[PDB]
């Protein structure tokens, strides 16, 4: 079992927030893209990292990858719903629960990153990450779209110094 499995599990769970958010933005006629919100989120995560004496640039690259992967899922859903608007699913009443989940999963990922910092900077990181993705793809039943998203979201893990 990979030492990175808890981190990868948290990243995959965070990817899953794309579906309620996409459904909500579709029904509410809101854009997927929000560059100002991304800048504010990444700046805050860089400051959370600095508060814990973690390298902020490593953290903000990781979370930019994660956010791009999340947005990619939302764009894929919008493509499906453009082809068949009747298939757009019931959306959550609001995004307060999604905001809470994202905050919780941000914290879980950052704490796992620091907890395994020695491995993330070590030569075995890539192998350990491959193993973790495989196991999480199984345990969370990830389809082709989420598998690609997980690859994108984790592509900068083995960059820690």
């Amino acid at each position: 079992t990979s030492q990175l499995a808890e981190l990868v599990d948290a990243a995959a769970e965070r990817l899953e927030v794309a579906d309620p958010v996409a459904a909500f933005k579709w029904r509410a006629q809101l854009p997927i893209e929000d560059s100002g919100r991304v800048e504010q989120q990444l700046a805050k995560l860089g400051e959370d990292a600095r508060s814990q004496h973690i390298d902020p640039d490593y953290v903000t690259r990781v979370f930019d990858d994660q956010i791009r992967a999340t947005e990619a899922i939302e764009y894929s859903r919008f493509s499906d719903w453009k082809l068949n608007p009747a298939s757009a699913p019931p959306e959550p009443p609001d995004l307060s629960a999604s905001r809470s989940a994202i905050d919780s999963l941000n914290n879980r990922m950052l704490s796992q990153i620091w907890s395994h910092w020695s491995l993330l900077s070590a030569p075995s990181c890539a192998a350990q990450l491959d193993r973790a993705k495989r196991d999480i793809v199984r345990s969370r039943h990830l389809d082709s779209l989420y598998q690609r998203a997980l690859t994108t979201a984790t592509q900068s893990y083995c960059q820690a110094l």
Binding site: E33, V38, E39, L42, D65
Partner: peptide, 14 residues
Amino acid sequence: XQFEQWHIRGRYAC
């Protein structure tokens, strides 16, 4: 995607 040239996102894959 969308980002200003001074944004954090501008430093990375985008």
